[PDB]
Ligand binder design. Structure first.
Ligand SMILES: [Mg+2]
Length: 167
């Protein structure tokens, strides 16, 4: 009941960080709690008392990755467009238009507000440090992790960052 939702779409409002090394060659990823073998980036629900998305983003980056640094860019918004859980056994599923196919119209699950952070410190002890792993990855490696994790929206956030893509 601390959770904030879009007054328009009902999507849950979430903020997180693309945390880059000063040389911009690697990004910090954490293992998912829902899927322990899948590598994602730190993010979490904005809480009712938080005054801005930067606050949520830096709180989640500390709670989930033991990462501290400074926000150096606003990477804007991306949306979790994954269908509902009930969808799989539904009657109508897809919409087709002559030269393309799309999944049937639905509201986003989540609206993500992402910021790029320059890592200033990684600490060995942090709130979720026994419940998650956290590791730096080059662009090529991070990109493959996020496809494997089935999170293209997190890949879109990574691609807006200043991470060096010429590995
Ligand atoms: Mg989270």
């Amino acid at each position: 009941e601390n959770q904030v939702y879009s007054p328009v779409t009902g999507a849950r409002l979430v903020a997180g960080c693309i945390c880059l090394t000063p040389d911009k060659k690697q990004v910090l990823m954490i293992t998912s709690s829902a899927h322990k073998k899948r590598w994602i980036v730190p993010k979490g629900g904005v809480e009712k008392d938080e005054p801005n998305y930067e606050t949520t983003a830096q709180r989640e980056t500390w709670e989930e990755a033991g990462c501290i640094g400074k926000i150096v860019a606003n990477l804007g918004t991306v949306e979790d467009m994954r269908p509902p859980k009930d969808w799989n056994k539904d009657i109508k599923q897809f919409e087709n238009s002559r030269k393309d196919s799309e999944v049937a119209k639905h509201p986003p699950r989540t609206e993500f507000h992402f910021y790029e952070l320059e890592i200033e410190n990684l600490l060995d002890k942090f709130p979720e440090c026994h419940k998650r792993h956290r590791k730096l990855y080059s662009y090529t490696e991070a990109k493959q992790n996020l496809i494997d994790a089935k999170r293209p929206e997190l890949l879109e956030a990574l691609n807006r960052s200043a991470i060096i893509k010429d590995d």
